Structures are given as C-alpha cells and as structure tokens.
Scaffold this motif. Structure first.
Motif, PDB file in Angstrom:
ATOM      1  N   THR A 288       0.861  -1.163   0.105  1.00  9.05           N
ATOM      2  CA  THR A 288       0.009   0.194  -0.019  1.00  9.05           C
ATOM      3  C   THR A 288       0.995   1.261  -0.066  1.00  9.05           C
ATOM      4  N   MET A 289       2.058   1.226   0.441  1.00 10.27           N
ATOM      5  CA  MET A 289       2.860   2.451   0.817  1.00 10.27           C
ATOM      6  C   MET A 289       3.787   2.365  -0.646  1.00 10.27           C
ATOM      7  N   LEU A 290       4.587   1.216  -0.592  1.00 10.31           N
ATOM      8  CA  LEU A 290       5.594   1.204  -1.679  1.00 10.31           C
ATOM      9  C   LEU A 290       5.062  -0.031  -2.451  1.00 10.31           C
ATOM     10  N   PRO A 291       4.525   0.069  -3.579  1.00  8.81           N
ATOM     11  CA  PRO A 291       3.976  -0.925  -4.484  1.00  8.81           C
ATOM     12  C   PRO A 291       5.349  -1.703  -5.110  1.00  8.81           C
ATOM     13  N   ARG A 292       5.156  -3.019  -5.297  1.00  9.02           N
ATOM     14  CA  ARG A 292       6.186  -3.893  -5.687  1.00  9.02           C
ATOM     15  C   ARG A 292       6.787  -3.177  -7.196  1.00  9.02           C
ATOM     16  N   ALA A 293       5.861  -2.917  -8.005  1.00 10.91           N
ATOM     17  CA  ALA A 293       6.431  -2.356  -9.290  1.00 10.91           C
ATOM     18  C   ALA A 293       7.148  -0.977  -9.270  1.00 10.91           C
ATOM     19  N   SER A 294       6.786  -0.156  -8.010  1.00 11.08           N
ATOM     20  CA  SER A 294       7.751   1.062  -8.023  1.00 11.08           C
ATOM     21  C   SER A 294       9.043   0.795  -7.279  1.00 11.08           C
ATOM     22  N   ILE A 295       8.947  -0.262  -6.550  1.00 10.46           N
ATOM     23  CA  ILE A 295      10.159  -0.975  -5.817  1.00 10.46           C
ATOM     24  C   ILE A 295      11.288  -1.124  -6.962  1.00 10.46           C
ATOM     25  N   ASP A 296      10.677  -2.378  -7.655  1.00  8.46           N
ATOM     26  CA  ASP A 296      11.464  -2.774  -8.683  1.00  8.46           C
ATOM     27  C   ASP A 296      12.044  -1.758  -9.651  1.00  8.46           C
ATOM     28  N   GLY A 297      11.190  -0.980 -10.229  1.00  6.07           N
ATOM     29  CA  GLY A 297      11.203  -0.066 -11.396  1.00  6.07           C
ATOM     30  C   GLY A 297      12.160   1.156 -10.812  1.00  6.07           C
ATOM     31  N   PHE A 298      12.548   1.249  -9.477  1.00 10.22           N
ATOM     32  CA  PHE A 298      13.033   2.653  -9.066  1.00 10.22           C
ATOM     33  C   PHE A 298      13.934   3.243  -9.593  1.00 10.22           C
ATOM     34  N   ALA A 299      15.040   2.380 -10.261  1.00 12.08           N
ATOM     35  CA  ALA A 299      16.290   3.225 -11.035  1.00 12.08           C
ATOM     36  C   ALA A 299      15.974   3.658 -12.136  1.00 12.08           C
ATOM     37  N   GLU A 300      15.007   3.218 -12.962  1.00 13.01           N
ATOM     38  CA  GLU A 300      14.439   3.934 -14.188  1.00 13.01           C
ATOM     39  C   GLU A 300      13.328   4.907 -13.867  1.00 13.01           C
ATOM     40  N   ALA A 301      12.951   5.230 -12.535  1.00 10.74           N
ATOM     41  CA  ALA A 301      11.630   5.993 -12.512  1.00 10.74           C
ATOM     42  C   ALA A 301      11.977   7.639 -12.620  1.00 10.74           C
ATOM     43  N   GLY A 302      13.050   8.155 -12.698  1.00 13.40           N
ATOM     44  CA  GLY A 302      13.057   9.593 -12.768  1.00 13.40           C
ATOM     45  C   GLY A 302      13.474  10.279 -11.541  1.00 13.40           C
ATOM     46  N   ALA A 303      13.831  11.325 -11.515  1.00 11.98           N
ATOM     47  CA  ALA A 303      14.301  12.010 -10.142  1.00 11.98           C
ATOM     48  C   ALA A 303      13.160  12.212  -9.252  1.00 11.98           C
ATOM     49  N   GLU A 304      12.207  12.935  -9.716  1.00  9.97           N
ATOM     50  CA  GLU A 304      11.215  13.240  -8.798  1.00  9.97           C
ATOM     51  C   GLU A 304      10.322  12.106  -8.154  1.00  9.97           C
ATOM     52  N   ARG A 305      10.120  11.202  -8.937  1.00 12.70           N
ATOM     53  CA  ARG A 305       9.483   9.956  -8.438  1.00 12.70           C
ATOM     54  C   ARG A 305      10.506   9.270  -7.599  1.00 12.70           C
TER      55      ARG A 305
END
Ligand SMILES: NC(=O)c1ccc[n+]([C@@H]2O[C@H](COP(=O)([O-])OP(=O)(O)OC[C@H]3O[C@@H](n4cnc5c(N)ncnc54)[C@H](OP(=O)(O)O)[C@@H]3O)[C@@H](O)[C@H]2O)c1
Ligand SMILES: NC(=O)c1ccc[n+]([C@@H]2O[C@H](COP(=O)([O-])OP(=O)(O)OC[C@H]3O[C@@H](n4cnc5c(N)ncnc54)[C@H](OP(=O)(O)O)[C@@H]3O)[C@@H](O)[C@H]2O)c1
Lengths: 424, 418
Positions: A288-305
């Motif tokens: 709910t706080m950190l979705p799996r897709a956001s964790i795994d994708g973090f390195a490509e997410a862009g500085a603001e995200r």
C-alpha cells in the motif's frame, strides 16, 4: 575452517558475532581490545567467570544465548601465532589504525581477516597496510547485519539485538573465495541471508550507513542536535522538526546514491537499486505504501518519483507497520531513537559520537578516493562541508582547548594508498 | 442593511452568528428550527428565560422562535441558513416565499458548488432575494450539553473564508464581510458564488481520504480500534494512492469550476495558508506558490509531504525529548444507533458523500465525467451497501439508503443557463 578466531574490538557487534561463531564452532575464541575503561571492565568480568550474553528483543528473543570467550587481551604483546581468523569489530573509521597496530610478526598463521562494516575502499586500504608477503585474505561484509547495543556499560559483556537485517553481501580479495560460504553459514544462524559477490567493492557498495547516515546526519538539523548541550536531542529517524528527515535530505540521499553508483561503476562494481535495497534487504513496508512495481522499477523512475518514493519509505516507518496495534490503533514507535550528543571524555575534552564522526570520516575518504577516478562528487562534498562548518563553529564557541583532536583531517594519503593498491 | 434577521437552524453555528450580528448591529432576531427534540428543549429553555449564550463571549436575546415555516410573518429582511448544507434545498422549498416579499438577503453559511444556484432554482419567479454563498463556516463551535441547548462554545476561529453573491454589485456582501470579521476571521469577497463555493477544504480533503477503503472500514466497524483520520497507513487512511486521488479530484473540481466561470485554487497554497502551515524546511514557499504548475508527480509528492509534516504540530512546543504535540490523532467517529435504534453514519463521511454525489451529477451537464470522483462515490456505495446487507435494512436509518442527485443537478444547470 575458521580455526581459532580472534575478535578485534569487543563491543556490541563482537558479542553478536561471538554468539554466531560459537553456534558454528570456532575452535578457540579470543578477543583483543585496546586499553581503557571498557577493557578493564571486560577483564574484571571475565576474571569473575562472566560469559558473553546476547539478548534478542521482542520478535528476536529466539536469538538469545551465551557464549564463552577463551582468552581476552588488552595488550598485543601477549598475542602469539595461534590465530587463523581475525574479525574486525572496531569502528570502520579505525580499520587502518587497528590493522597497523596488530603485531603481524606474531600472526603469520592468519589466513583471513573479516571487515564487519566495510565501505568503498576498505578492503584495499586494509590490504595496503598489511606487511609484505602477508597472505591473509581480506573479506568485506557490506554492513553489520543487525542492530545491537551494550545496554549497560558496567556489564560490558551483555548486549541486546533489537533488529536483524534480511540480507547483506560479502566480497573477498581472493577470487572465488571459499571463506565466503563459511561466513554465509555463520550469519545464517541468526536468520540473515549473506549473498556472495564477486569483488570486495561490490559488497562495499551495499553498505547501508554510507547511503543513509551521510544525507541525514551530516546535515544542519542533525549537527545542531548533536553539537548541543542543553536543548532536546531529537530523534534520528523522524521528520523535521522532531528529526532530520526533510525533502532536502531525501534529495541529498538520491544525489549521493547517483554519485556513489558512478564511483562503483568506475571500480568495476554493479550499483544497487537504493529503494529495493532499503525495503527488501533491510526493513520493508506494505505494498500500500511502496508498490512492488515501484520498488523494482526505482532505478528507471526519474528523479522526482525517486525522491517521492524515498520520502514515503521513511515516513511509512515512523511507526513499525508490522507491529501489533494497541486498542486505539497505534503501532510501535521505532523511529524514537534519540540522537547521541557531544560529551566530555575523562580528560575533560569534547568528543563526538560515532554518528556523525565515523560517518564523516568514511565519506571524506570515499570522496578523496573518487578524485582518483576523476569524480567530483559535489553532493558528497556539500555534506562534508556541512559537517566541517558545523563542527568548526562548535570549536569556535567551546574553545579548541576544550575539544578532542578528532574534531579537528587529511584523507588524501589513505585514498592514495587505496588507489595504488587498486592499480597493482 | 441587515434589518430583522431570521436564523434558520438554531444550532451551534447560529449562536455564533447571532453574537456577531449583535456586535455589528441588527434589528429583531428570530429563529426557525424544525420540529424535534432539540426544538422542544429550546422552547422550554426560552419559556424559562434563556438567551443565546456564546463562550469563547456574550449573550443575545431571541425575540421570536418558530418551528413551522408557514407561521412566518413578512417581517424579515435577512435569512441565514445555519442547517446542514444537504437541507438547504428542503429548507428553501418549504418557506412561504410568496408572502415573504420583504426578504432581501439569504446567506448560506456552508455552501457547496452549485448551492447558490440550487437555492435560487427554488425561489418564486419575481423573488427579489439576493443569495450569498460563504465558502465554509468560519469557526469551530459546539453546544456542550443539550440540557442548556442555547449555550455554545467556540473553540477556534478560521483565518480566512470567502463570500460570493448572486447579485453582481451587492451591498449585503460588504455588510456580511464586516459582520463576520468581528469574530477575527478575514472574509475575502469574490466576484461569483461559485468562486466562493469552490474554496471549501472538506470537498478537496474529505472526499479522497474518508470515502476510501481504509476509512470506510473504520467508520463502519463496531469493534476494534477506530484508527485516526489524519495518520499514514496503517494507523490512518493516508497513502500515496489517497494522495493520488486527492490530486486527480482537485483537477476534476478545478475544471468544473472553470466551466462554471470561477477561478480554481492552488490546492497546496490553500491548505497551507488557509488551513495549517508547515515550515519552509518542509515545503518551501516557492514550491507552495508553484504547485499548480508543478506537474503531477511533484504535486503528489508535495501533498504527501504536507500531510506527513503535520502528523505532529510543528509549531507546538517541544517536550524534553523533542516531541511535538500529536494533533493527527483525531479518531474516526463510527456508526452508532440513534434513539430509534437505527444505525446512523457520522457527518463525516455522510455529508461529504452527499456533496460529491451532487457535484458529479452537476458536472455531467458540463460534459465532465469526473472518473476519480465517481470511483470515490462507488467505494462509499459499495461499503455502505455491504453494511446494510450485514445489519439489515430494517436496522439502518434511511439516510444510508441510495440517493439520486440528478434532479437537483438538473435544477442547478437550468438555473445557471437562465
Ligand atoms: N552496533 C550496531 O548495531 C551497528 C550498526 C550499524 C553499524 N555498525 C558498525 O559496527 C561498528 C562497531 O560497532 P559497535 O556498536 O560494536 O561499537 P562499540 O560497541 O562502540 O565497540 C567496538 C569496540 O571497538 C573498541 N574501539 C573503539 N574505537 C577504537 C579504536 N579507534 N581503536 C581500537 N579499538 C576501538 C571499543 O573499545 P573502547 O570503547 O574502549 O574504545 C569497543 O570495544 C560501528 O562502528 C559501525 O561501524 C554497528
Ligand atoms: N459547528 C461547527 O463548528 C461546524 C464546523 C464546520 C462545518 N459546520 C457545518 O455548519 C452547519 C451547521 O452546523 P451546526 O453545528 O450548527 O449543526 P447543529 O448543531 O446540528 O444545528 C443545526 C440546527 O439546525 C436544525 N435543523 C436541521 N435541519 C433543519 C431544517 N431543515 N430546518 C430547520 N432546522 C433544521 C437542527 O435541529 P435538529 O437537530 O432537530 O435537526 C439544529 O438545531 C452544518 O452544515 C455543519 O456541517 C459546522
């Protein structure tokens, strides 16, 4: 395998390590700790028949146990060539001093030397200090694998472990090193997974305190609390104004992670996904706080995200979301760790605690090393300048006469030895 | 320019308004409170000499008290609606407007988007009344105990509210700015009612936080911990997803406002400057002022920071450890059985759902689908429907049952097109 094991430094880390070593079956277990009040108290307890005691807090109670120490030295003059493994449980900023100070003429039998809290360059620095023809392998553990402290300094052999990491990493100066598996097993006994990596620097690149302590405890808020005598100490992991965590500090965390990652690439090590490292290897939050897709994708997410996600990560851990709630629905406040502050030593001189002195010293060495790879590291340099200016103003106000000389350094010699060692 | 004032809904808000009116200067003071137990206590209290009593503080005589709108004489120049906003239409339709030609001004103290227009759609052709829309009630006020039903306590006053008028050049609007400013609030007049109606914090905050899954689970529970309205998950409803709903809803509401001729607001600036501020270290002034142009990821991050930064009161005094006061620990009020034994929902989220339901139905007329608002409405409807399933419809107050806001939306749109 481990043979006879000498623990160098007998503090909180060493007691946990001793429990895991005795489970495994060291052989002889000894310890060396330099003279002082702590060593005196240890020798007194040991002479009284005391043993090392490890308590696990709460969830970790199952860790609890006792471990015997065969010998304790506070004087290197009595060491003999009886030891196959050395385990450095001293502060990481003292590795160079401690390695220079060991009596290597009486330690030819040492085959392995383990650095329990390594940082980028530590393996190389330690090897630069070994005597010629020393054939000890040097092992770098990414981070100490728990959270442990000696609760009562008058019972120096009793420690309390309140957290255990999910995963740490282990590298070795010897390619395809067989000692990595031995230590995997030792740490597995406390439930931590050790992942062997191909070089020391890969493992050192996963030292959590370099990434976390640097942005949070070298900034203005932390230094103000640490260098204070009167006000409230505040809390290490809370949000401003209770603690140091702010969007600015999160931005420093991201930018420093980028700089350290580039340094790692230039040293032939793969950098880490900072968010997934924090969440999966150290301590998690709910989807709910950190979705799996956001964790795994973090390195490509862009500085603001990236900054948003890091902030969420720390805000979500102001309380332990996996603790039981009380009847109001409150969860356990485990961001309530007070800052330790300056204090006077037995000579009446102000001393800094390990947070931030060790943190500064490690980052200053890393910055000096990075210069050799043509890396300026401006965010790291800004954090160093923040510490230097704050401590300078404290000396101005308190008086240089009142301050321990550790508050007054040049990292370029050690960084030069590291680079020369790397280039051999 | 106030003349004789009729307070409709003699509750906490009305008692504060009464004292502010008396400080300013007005004629006779009357009140209309519909039949019920509260009205019976008021009638008895008045019979025993009671007056309106405000404590922060002052006293005000009530000259006239009615329960039945048909009994009103054409003796009132100003009406102030101090009832729940969901009753405005009902109140107005029930008044004998054809023999109330002396009413010049009708003030809506807590107006939602379209309320001014909805009220006017119910007035008789020819009716000369000006309708004023206040963006929200300007204080925090409660009747302590119903045994002294005309004695209220005001806990706090807001910094700022906004006031708009159905009449372009409106003398009553400046009068009311002055009346309410006697409480210490700053009243900002705006050029249309809808501009004022769009500056109500609850529309923007209660919708995403308290119509979601976590809040509804707390509100509809009988046992277990109530949880906290303004904490992060798992202690309260605030999550990145709820912040994302907050952002998207603000975008939807802001486009509705533009199509209705009103300038929308900068949500972060509104929260910080009209509700509660944080330090520059957490939200720089330039980030606050630039929020509307920042782009969605940054906007969501800033909103999350705002609420995380207020888990404690950063301006409160620190304790010896350095802890600040925990003023996010507002517990959820939960369902409770009324005097007839029937389950009732608290005002939060009942009034919030009703308001958003009307907004969505109205927005359809402006060719706006409002998918985020609709998802919040559906989350409420699904949770309450399950609650009724479990408890039994016979056991639930009819305010829980489905509603249809399309007739009121249609009347607003017809009025706006005239
Ligand atoms: N404890 C944790 O949970 C934790 C967590 C994260 C990282 N770490 C890392 O693990 C390292 C050791 O932590 P710890 O908690 O075990 O420290 P500790 O409890 O303070 O003790 C470490 C031992 O080393 C001795 N020592 C300190 N400075 C020395 C020096 N310059 N030269 C020689 N000996 C020295 C100390 O004895 P004296 O006091 O007499 O000097 C003590 O016996 C930390 O520095 C950090 O790098 C620990
Ligand atoms: N009080 C605050 O601090 C505050 C803060 C923010 C927003 N608000 C909003 O401001 C409005 C007034 O709040 P309040 O606290 O004064 O409510 P309240 O204390 O319940 O008083 C409402 C009064 O109006 C009566 N009433 C309800 N419907 C009526 C109708 N159709 N015709 C005539 N009288 C009617 C009620 O009598 P019965 O009880 O018998 O129905 C009651 O006496 C509400 O919409 C509230 O949500 C209030």
């Amino acid at each position: 395998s481990l043979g006879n094991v000498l623990l160098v430094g007998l503090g909180a880390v060493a007691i946990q390590v001793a429990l895991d070593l005795r489970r495994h079956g060291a052989g002889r277990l000894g310890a060396l700790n330099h003279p002082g009040r702590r060593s005196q108290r240890i020798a007194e307890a040991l002479a009284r028949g005391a043993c090392l005691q490890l308590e696990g807090q709460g969830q970790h109670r199952w860790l609890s146990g006792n471990a015997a120490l065969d010998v304790f030295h506070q004087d290197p003059a009595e060491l003999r060539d009886d030891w196959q493994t050395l385990v450095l449980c001293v502060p990481a900023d003292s590795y160079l001093d401690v390695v220079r100070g060991l009596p290597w003429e009486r330690l030819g039998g040492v085959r392995t030397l383990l650095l329990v809290s390594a940082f980028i360059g530590a393996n190389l620095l330690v090897r630069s200090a070994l005597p010629a023809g020393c054939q000890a392998t040097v092992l770098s553990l990414s981070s100490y694998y728990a959270a442990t402290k000696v609760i009562d300094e008058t019972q120096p052999l009793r420690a309390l472990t309140k957290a255990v990491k999910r995963r740490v990493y282990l590298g070795s100066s010897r390619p395809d090193c067989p000692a990595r598996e031995t230590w995997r097993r030792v740490l597995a006994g406390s439930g931590v997974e050790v992942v062997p990596l191909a070089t020391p620097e890969a493992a050192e690149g996963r030292n959590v305190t370099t990434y976390v302590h640097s942005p949070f405890f070298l900034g203005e808020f932390a230094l103000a609390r640490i260098l204070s005598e009167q006000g409230p100490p505040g809390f290490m992991y809370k949000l401003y104004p209770e603690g140091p965590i702010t969007p600015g500090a999160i931005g420093a965390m991201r930018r420093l992670w980028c700089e350290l990652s580039e340094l790692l690439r230039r040293m032939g090590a793969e950098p880490l996904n900072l968010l997934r490292f924090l969440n999966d290897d150290n301590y998690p939050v709910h989807e709910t706080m950190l979705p799996r897709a956001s964790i795994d994708g973090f390195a490509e997410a862009g500085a603001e995200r990236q900054e948003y996600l890091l902030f969420v990560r720390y805000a979500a851990l102001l309380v332990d979301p996996f603790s039981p709630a009380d009847e109001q629905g409150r969860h356990f406040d485990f961001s309530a760790v007070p800052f330790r502050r300056v204090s006077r030593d037995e000579d009446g001189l102000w001393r800094l605690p390990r947070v931030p002195l060790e943190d500064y010293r490690k980052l200053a060495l890393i910055v000096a090393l990075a210069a050799h790879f043509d890396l300026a590291m401006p965010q790291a340099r800004s954090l160093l300048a923040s510490y230097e200016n704050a401590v300078s103003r404290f000396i101005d106000c308190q008086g240089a006469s009142q301050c321990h000389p550790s508050l007054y350094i040049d990292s370029r010699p050690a960084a030069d030895a590291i680079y020369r060692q790397w280039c051999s």
